[PDB]
Amino acid sequence: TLVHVASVEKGRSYEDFQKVYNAIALKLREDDEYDNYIGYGPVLVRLAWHISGTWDKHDNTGGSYGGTYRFKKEFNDPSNAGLQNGFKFLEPIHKEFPWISSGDLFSLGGVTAVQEMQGPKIPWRCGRVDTPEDTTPDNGRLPDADKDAGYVRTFFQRLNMNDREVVALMGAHALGKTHLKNSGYEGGGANNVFTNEFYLNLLNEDWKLEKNDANNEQWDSKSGYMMLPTDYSLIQDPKYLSIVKEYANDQDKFFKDFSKAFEKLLENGITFPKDAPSPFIFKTLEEQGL
Numbered sequence: 001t002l003v004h005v006a007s008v009e010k011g012r013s014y015e016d017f018q019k020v021y022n023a024i025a026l027k028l029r030e031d032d033e034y035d036n037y038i039g040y041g042p043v044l045v046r047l048a049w050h051i052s053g054t055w056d057k058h059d060n061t062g063g064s065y066g067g068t069y070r071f072k073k074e075f076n077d078p079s080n081a082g083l084q085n086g087f088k089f090l091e092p093i094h095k096e097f098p099w100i101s102s103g104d105l106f107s108l109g110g111v112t113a114v115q116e117m118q119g120p121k122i123p124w125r126c127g128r129v130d131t132p133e134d135t136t137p138d139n140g141r142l143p144d145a146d147k148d149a150g151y152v153r154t155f156f157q158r159l160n161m162n163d164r165e166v167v168a169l170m171g172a173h174a175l176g177k178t179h180l181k182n183s184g185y186e187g188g189g190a191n192n193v194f195t196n197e198f199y200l201n202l203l204n205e206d207w208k209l210e211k212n213d214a215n216n217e218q219w220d221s222k223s224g225y226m227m228l229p230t231d232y233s234l235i236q237d238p239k240y241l242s243i244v245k246e247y248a249n250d251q252d253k254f255f256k257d258f259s260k261a262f263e264k265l266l267e268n269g270i271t272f273p274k275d276a277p278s279p280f281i282f283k284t285l286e287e288q289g290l
């Protein structure tokens with residue numbers, strides 16, 4: 001119903017966005033201490049998903065386009081607790097590059113994090129345009145963690161995602177950790193390297209249903225790993241489980257499927273002129289010798 005047309009920031013081209021990529025990537029390298037030396041990679045990915053995950057396919061409300069996370073209603077969404085750190089991270093980036101829209105910056109931060117953490121290339125398109133504060137979606141559009149596969153499946157229909165896209169997207173839970181103070185879930189062992197480990201862990205660990213100090217159930221393993229009830233639902237549902245096994249046994253296929261679904265997620269709600277530039281594929285720092 002609402003239409004949002006991609007409008008390229010004036011006169012900008014690939015090299016401009018590569019420059020923004022690189023500033024994000026260098027800071028990512030710089031600020032290595034954050035969250036017990038996990039770095040900001042994971043929270044930037046989470047931020048990019050939460051700013052896109054407000055989308056509603058039925059009326060094209062929410063979505064990354066409007067960059068509405070900058071307004072207090074959305075930034076104070078309880079579902080977004082902890083994400084202020086990612087916002088604070090990108091603040092000097094925005095100040096150095098004031099011409100990039102908020103939506104483009106938030107989504108590009110997510111792409112950059114994934115690639116720098118050795119995940120797949122994620123094609124990325126520019127052209128999100130900031131929209132006014134009253135276009136900010138209401139709280140409560142992001143998913144709950146204490147639910148089952150049916151919830152997860154239904155939830156993601158609203159973002160136009162199918163079983164394979166959901167299971168692939170969840171693979172980002174290889175990254176970073178939960179924070180009791182943020183979500184009511186107790187962090188387990190944490191990584192900042194993007195791999196298909198989330199699926200391996202699901203299938204190979206000895207999971208026990210435990211209560212954490214916030215009185216929420218989560219699945220914990222002797223090895224110090226953890227899963228959310230919605231994570232675990234991927235192996236409880238037989239359709240989800242088949243895909244989990246696939247990604248666990250095929251790193252390349254996971255990367256390819258993640259790349260597509262993550263780009264899709266970041267682009268939901270946006271109309272790209274026939275006219276628009278092709279998606280950009282940014283080189284990593286290591287590819288550039290930086």
Ligand code: HEM
Binds near residue numbers: 046143170178185262
């Ligand atoms: C049913 C879906 C999902 C639910 C219930 C869920 C729930 C959560 C929870 C509770 C947190 C911890 C927040 C805090 O304690 O710091 C979180 C962390 C995170 N989520 Fe999800 N999530 C879902 C899907 C996704 C998807 C689609 C992505 C991205 C493609 C993703 C990326 C992340 C990342 C990277 C973290 C780690 C953040 C950090 O370490 O600071 N999540 N998830």
Ligand SMILES: c1ccc2[nH]cnc2c1
Binds near residue numbers: 175226
């Ligand atoms: C968020 C972050 C890390 C995770 N590891 C397993 N499930 C997770 C959710």
